[PDB]
mmCIF file of all heavy atoms in Angstrom:
data_model
loop_
_atom_site.group_PDB
_atom_site.id
_atom_site.type_symbol
_atom_site.label_atom_id
_atom_site.label_comp_id
_atom_site.label_asym_id
_atom_site.label_seq_id
_atom_site.Cartn_x
_atom_site.Cartn_y
_atom_site.Cartn_z
ATOM 1 N N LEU A 1189 151.662 -54.530 -33.311
ATOM 2 C CA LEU A 1189 152.777 -53.650 -32.978
ATOM 3 C C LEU A 1189 152.306 -52.447 -32.172
ATOM 4 O O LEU A 1189 153.116 -51.692 -31.636
ATOM 5 C CB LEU A 1189 153.477 -53.175 -34.256
ATOM 6 C CG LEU A 1189 154.107 -54.276 -35.118
ATOM 7 C CD1 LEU A 1189 154.671 -53.665 -36.393
ATOM 8 C CD2 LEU A 1189 155.197 -54.982 -34.322
ATOM 9 N N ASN A 1190 150.989 -52.271 -32.092
ATOM 10 C CA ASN A 1190 150.406 -51.223 -31.264
ATOM 11 C C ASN A 1190 150.496 -51.574 -29.785
ATOM 12 O O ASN A 1190 150.942 -50.766 -28.971
ATOM 13 C CB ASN A 1190 148.965 -50.967 -31.666
ATOM 14 C CG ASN A 1190 148.342 -49.839 -30.892
ATOM 15 O OD1 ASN A 1190 148.833 -48.704 -30.919
ATOM 16 N ND2 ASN A 1190 147.268 -50.127 -30.203
ATOM 17 N N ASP A 1191 150.069 -52.786 -29.443
ATOM 18 C CA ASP A 1191 150.239 -53.305 -28.091
ATOM 19 C C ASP A 1191 151.710 -53.538 -27.773
ATOM 20 O O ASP A 1191 152.363 -54.383 -28.389
ATOM 21 C CB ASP A 1191 149.459 -54.609 -27.915
ATOM 22 C CG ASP A 1191 149.513 -55.145 -26.491
ATOM 23 O OD1 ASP A 1191 150.319 -54.667 -25.727
ATOM 24 O OD2 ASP A 1191 148.748 -56.027 -26.179
ATOM 25 N N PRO A 1192 152.228 -52.786 -26.808
ATOM 26 C CA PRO A 1192 153.634 -52.888 -26.428
ATOM 27 C C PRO A 1192 154.018 -54.327 -26.116
ATOM 28 O O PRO A 1192 155.132 -54.760 -26.408
ATOM 29 C CB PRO A 1192 153.717 -51.998 -25.183
ATOM 30 C CG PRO A 1192 152.675 -50.957 -25.406
ATOM 31 C CD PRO A 1192 151.534 -51.702 -26.049
ATOM 32 N N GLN A 1193 153.087 -55.068 -25.522
ATOM 33 C CA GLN A 1193 153.345 -56.445 -25.120
ATOM 34 C C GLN A 1193 153.495 -57.354 -26.334
ATOM 35 O O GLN A 1193 154.403 -58.183 -26.392
ATOM 36 C CB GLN A 1193 152.222 -56.961 -24.218
ATOM 37 C CG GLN A 1193 152.458 -58.354 -23.661
ATOM 38 C CD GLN A 1193 153.655 -58.411 -22.732
ATOM 39 O OE1 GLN A 1193 153.736 -57.663 -21.754
ATOM 40 N NE2 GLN A 1193 154.595 -59.301 -23.032
ATOM 41 N N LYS A 1194 152.599 -57.193 -27.301
ATOM 42 C CA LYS A 1194 152.624 -58.004 -28.512
ATOM 43 C C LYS A 1194 153.804 -57.634 -29.399
ATOM 44 O O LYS A 1194 154.396 -58.492 -30.054
ATOM 45 C CB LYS A 1194 151.315 -57.851 -29.288
ATOM 46 C CG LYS A 1194 150.108 -58.492 -28.618
ATOM 47 C CD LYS A 1194 148.856 -58.335 -29.468
ATOM 48 C CE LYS A 1194 147.635 -58.915 -28.770
ATOM 49 N NZ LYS A 1194 146.413 -58.818 -29.613
ATOM 50 N N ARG A 1195 154.147 -56.349 -29.416
ATOM 51 C CA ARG A 1195 155.308 -55.876 -30.157
ATOM 52 C C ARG A 1195 156.594 -56.485 -29.615
ATOM 53 O O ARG A 1195 157.439 -56.956 -30.376
ATOM 54 C CB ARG A 1195 155.403 -54.359 -30.090
ATOM 55 C CG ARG A 1195 156.569 -53.756 -30.857
ATOM 56 C CD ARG A 1195 156.537 -52.270 -30.831
ATOM 57 N NE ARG A 1195 156.723 -51.748 -29.488
ATOM 58 C CZ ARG A 1195 157.901 -51.717 -28.835
ATOM 59 N NH1 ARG A 1195 158.985 -52.180 -29.415
ATOM 60 N NH2 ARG A 1195 157.966 -51.220 -27.612
ATOM 61 N N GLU A 1196 156.737 -56.475 -28.293
ATOM 62 C CA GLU A 1196 157.871 -57.117 -27.639
ATOM 63 C C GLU A 1196 157.939 -58.599 -27.986
ATOM 64 O O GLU A 1196 158.997 -59.114 -28.351
ATOM 65 C CB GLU A 1196 157.783 -56.942 -26.123
ATOM 66 C CG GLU A 1196 158.939 -57.560 -25.349
ATOM 67 C CD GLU A 1196 158.844 -57.324 -23.869
ATOM 68 O OE1 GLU A 1196 157.908 -56.688 -23.446
ATOM 69 O OE2 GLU A 1196 159.707 -57.781 -23.158
ATOM 70 N N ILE A 1197 156.804 -59.282 -27.868
ATOM 71 C CA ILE A 1197 156.726 -60.700 -28.197
ATOM 72 C C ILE A 1197 157.108 -60.951 -29.650
ATOM 73 O O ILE A 1197 157.815 -61.909 -29.960
ATOM 74 C CB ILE A 1197 155.310 -61.248 -27.935
ATOM 75 C CG1 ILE A 1197 155.017 -61.273 -26.433
ATOM 76 C CG2 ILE A 1197 155.159 -62.637 -28.534
ATOM 77 C CD1 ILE A 1197 153.563 -61.509 -26.100
ATOM 78 N N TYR A 1198 156.636 -60.084 -30.539
ATOM 79 C CA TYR A 1198 156.973 -60.176 -31.954
ATOM 80 C C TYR A 1198 158.477 -60.071 -32.171
ATOM 81 O O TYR A 1198 159.076 -60.903 -32.852
ATOM 82 C CB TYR A 1198 156.244 -59.091 -32.750
ATOM 83 C CG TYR A 1198 156.573 -59.094 -34.227
ATOM 84 C CD1 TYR A 1198 156.074 -60.095 -35.047
ATOM 85 C CD2 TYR A 1198 157.372 -58.095 -34.761
ATOM 86 C CE1 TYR A 1198 156.374 -60.097 -36.396
ATOM 87 C CE2 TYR A 1198 157.671 -58.096 -36.109
ATOM 88 C CZ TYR A 1198 157.176 -59.092 -36.925
ATOM 89 O OH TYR A 1198 157.474 -59.093 -38.269
ATOM 90 N N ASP A 1199 159.082 -59.041 -31.587
ATOM 91 C CA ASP A 1199 160.511 -58.800 -31.751
ATOM 92 C C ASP A 1199 161.333 -59.966 -31.217
ATOM 93 O O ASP A 1199 162.341 -60.350 -31.808
ATOM 94 C CB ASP A 1199 160.921 -57.508 -31.039
ATOM 95 C CG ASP A 1199 160.362 -56.260 -31.706
ATOM 96 O OD1 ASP A 1199 159.895 -56.360 -32.816
ATOM 97 O OD2 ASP A 1199 160.405 -55.216 -31.099
ATOM 98 N N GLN A 1200 160.893 -60.526 -30.094
ATOM 99 C CA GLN A 1200 161.675 -61.531 -29.386
ATOM 100 C C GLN A 1200 161.441 -62.921 -29.963
ATOM 101 O O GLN A 1200 162.363 -63.733 -30.045
ATOM 102 C CB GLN A 1200 161.332 -61.523 -27.892
ATOM 103 C CG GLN A 1200 161.787 -60.273 -27.157
ATOM 104 C CD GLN A 1200 161.372 -60.277 -25.698
ATOM 105 O OE1 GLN A 1200 160.456 -61.001 -25.301
ATOM 106 N NE2 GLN A 1200 162.047 -59.468 -24.890
ATOM 107 N N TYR A 1201 160.203 -63.188 -30.364
ATOM 108 C CA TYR A 1201 159.784 -64.542 -30.704
ATOM 109 C C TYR A 1201 159.318 -64.627 -32.151
ATOM 110 O O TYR A 1201 159.697 -65.541 -32.884
ATOM 111 C CB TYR A 1201 158.674 -65.012 -29.761
ATOM 112 C CG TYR A 1201 159.082 -65.041 -28.305
ATOM 113 C CD1 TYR A 1201 158.610 -64.073 -27.432
ATOM 114 C CD2 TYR A 1201 159.931 -66.038 -27.843
ATOM 115 C CE1 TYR A 1201 158.982 -64.100 -26.102
ATOM 116 C CE2 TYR A 1201 160.302 -66.065 -26.513
ATOM 117 C CZ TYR A 1201 159.826 -65.092 -25.642
ATOM 118 O OH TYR A 1201 160.198 -65.119 -24.318
ATOM 119 N N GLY A 1202 158.491 -63.669 -32.559
ATOM 120 C CA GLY A 1202 158.058 -63.569 -33.948
ATOM 121 C C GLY A 1202 156.541 -63.503 -34.048
ATOM 122 O O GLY A 1202 155.845 -63.411 -33.037
ATOM 123 N N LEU A 1203 156.031 -63.552 -35.275
ATOM 124 C CA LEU A 1203 154.610 -63.339 -35.524
ATOM 125 C C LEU A 1203 153.764 -64.396 -34.826
ATOM 126 O O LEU A 1203 152.770 -64.079 -34.172
ATOM 127 C CB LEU A 1203 154.326 -63.360 -37.030
ATOM 128 C CG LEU A 1203 152.859 -63.165 -37.435
ATOM 129 C CD1 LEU A 1203 152.370 -61.812 -36.932
ATOM 130 C CD2 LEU A 1203 152.731 -63.263 -38.947
ATOM 131 N N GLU A 1204 154.166 -65.655 -34.968
ATOM 132 C CA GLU A 1204 153.410 -66.767 -34.403
ATOM 133 C C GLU A 1204 153.084 -66.523 -32.934
ATOM 134 O O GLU A 1204 151.929 -66.617 -32.522
ATOM 135 C CB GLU A 1204 154.195 -68.073 -34.550
ATOM 136 C CG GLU A 1204 153.483 -69.301 -34.000
ATOM 137 C CD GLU A 1204 154.281 -70.563 -34.162
ATOM 138 O OE1 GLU A 1204 155.358 -70.497 -34.705
ATOM 139 O OE2 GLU A 1204 153.815 -71.596 -33.740
ATOM 140 N N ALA A 1205 154.111 -66.209 -32.151
ATOM 141 C CA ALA A 1205 153.933 -65.941 -30.729
ATOM 142 C C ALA A 1205 153.111 -64.679 -30.504
ATOM 143 O O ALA A 1205 152.273 -64.623 -29.603
ATOM 144 C CB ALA A 1205 155.284 -65.822 -30.039
ATOM 145 N N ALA A 1206 153.355 -63.666 -31.327
ATOM 146 C CA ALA A 1206 152.659 -62.390 -31.202
ATOM 147 C C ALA A 1206 151.160 -62.559 -31.413
ATOM 148 O O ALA A 1206 150.353 -61.920 -30.739
ATOM 149 C CB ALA A 1206 153.220 -61.378 -32.189
ATOM 150 N N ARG A 1207 150.793 -63.423 -32.353
ATOM 151 C CA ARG A 1207 149.390 -63.703 -32.632
ATOM 152 C C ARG A 1207 148.747 -64.484 -31.492
ATOM 153 O O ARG A 1207 147.595 -64.240 -31.132
ATOM 154 C CB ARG A 1207 149.248 -64.493 -33.927
ATOM 155 C CG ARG A 1207 149.584 -63.715 -35.188
ATOM 156 C CD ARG A 1207 149.534 -64.580 -36.395
ATOM 157 N NE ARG A 1207 148.181 -65.024 -36.688
ATOM 158 C CZ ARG A 1207 147.869 -66.017 -37.545
ATOM 159 N NH1 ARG A 1207 148.824 -66.656 -38.184
ATOM 160 N NH2 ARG A 1207 146.606 -66.347 -37.743
ATOM 161 N N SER A 1208 149.499 -65.422 -30.928
ATOM 162 C CA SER A 1208 149.015 -66.220 -29.807
ATOM 163 C C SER A 1208 149.011 -65.410 -28.517
ATOM 164 O O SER A 1208 148.266 -65.714 -27.585
ATOM 165 C CB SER A 1208 149.873 -67.458 -29.637
ATOM 166 O OG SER A 1208 151.188 -67.114 -29.295
ATOM 167 N N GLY A 1209 149.850 -64.382 -28.467
ATOM 168 C CA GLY A 1209 149.991 -63.565 -27.269
ATOM 169 C C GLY A 1209 150.987 -64.181 -26.295
ATOM 170 O O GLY A 1209 150.926 -63.935 -25.089
ATOM 171 N N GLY A 1210 151.904 -64.983 -26.824
ATOM 172 C CA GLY A 1210 152.890 -65.670 -25.996
ATOM 173 C C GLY A 1210 153.516 -66.841 -26.744
ATOM 174 O O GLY A 1210 152.876 -67.461 -27.594
ATOM 175 N N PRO A 1211 154.769 -67.139 -26.423
ATOM 176 C CA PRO A 1211 155.496 -68.214 -27.088
ATOM 177 C C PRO A 1211 154.988 -69.579 -26.644
ATOM 178 O O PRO A 1211 155.194 -70.581 -27.329
ATOM 179 C CB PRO A 1211 156.943 -67.977 -26.643
ATOM 180 C CG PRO A 1211 156.814 -67.301 -25.321
ATOM 181 C CD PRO A 1211 155.618 -66.398 -25.477
ATOM 182 N N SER A 1212 154.321 -69.612 -25.494
ATOM 183 C CA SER A 1212 153.749 -70.848 -24.975
ATOM 184 C C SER A 1212 152.341 -71.069 -25.509
ATOM 185 O O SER A 1212 151.687 -70.134 -25.973
ATOM 186 C CB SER A 1212 153.728 -70.817 -23.460
ATOM 187 O OG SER A 1212 152.820 -69.858 -22.991
#
């Protein structure tokens, strides 16, 4: 949630994507 990019991904996609750094 510190990284704006990962936070956005988390909000939009969720933890799984946030950990991977992308939904793909």
Side-chain angles (χ1 to χ4, degrees):
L1189 298 176
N1190 183 59
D1191 184 347
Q1193 184 65 55
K1194 290 182 183 182
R1195 181 176 65 75
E1196 181 178 0
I1197 291 168
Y1198 178 73
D1199 291 346
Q1200 292 177 340
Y1201 300 106
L1203 179 60
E1204 181 180 359
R1207 291 175 67 194
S1208 64
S1212 68

